[PDB]
């Protein structure tokens, strides 16, 4: 930590480290969105 590691904090023995991370969240709601598009309807031409 560049802020909490001061000159006076280190003079007392206090030295700080930051460990930021993200856990793996359980996929409790896998959503699927199904859509009937006519975009590839023009692909049947040849």
């Amino acid at each position: 930590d560049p802020d909490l590691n001061s000159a006076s904090q280190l003079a007392q023995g206090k030295v700080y480290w930051n460990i930021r991370f993200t856990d793996v969240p359980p996929a409790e709601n896998p959503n699927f969105r199904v859509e009937v598009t006519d975009q590839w309807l023009t692909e049947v031409l040849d």
């Binding site: 309807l41 023009t42 049947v44 031409l45 040849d46």
Partner: protein, 99 residues
């Protein structure tokens, strides 16, 4: 060759006789003729078949078959599927003119 018109009975030889024979063939089914079960087309059986790339290989065959059997005075140029609108399949049939 001189034939009669379908409606109105008029004797026409070149233009509409070649048209009243081709446009009839595409919508006349097989077996509708009496004692001639091989005249007609499978195009009435191509209804509600799924429009695939193997389906166009059949329609371009059945146009070349059913006109190749019973209409030798027409040279087929191209049967191109040009539009699929709402299930309706637009097949362009440009035919040459003879005589």
């Amino acid at each position: 060759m001189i034939g009669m018109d379908r409606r109105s009975g008029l004797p026409l030889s070149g233009l509409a006789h070649l048209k009243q024979s081709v446009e009839d063939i595409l919508t006349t089914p097989l077996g509708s003729r009496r004692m001639r079960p091989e005249y007609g087309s499978k195009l009435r059986r191509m209804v509600d078949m799924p429009v695939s790339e193997g389906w166009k290989s059949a329609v371009q065959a059945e146009v070349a078959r059913s006109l190749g059997r019973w209409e030798p005075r027409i040279g087929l140029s191209a049967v191109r599927v040009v539009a699929v609108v709402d299930g309706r399949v637009d097949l362009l049939l440009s035919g040459v003119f003879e005589g």
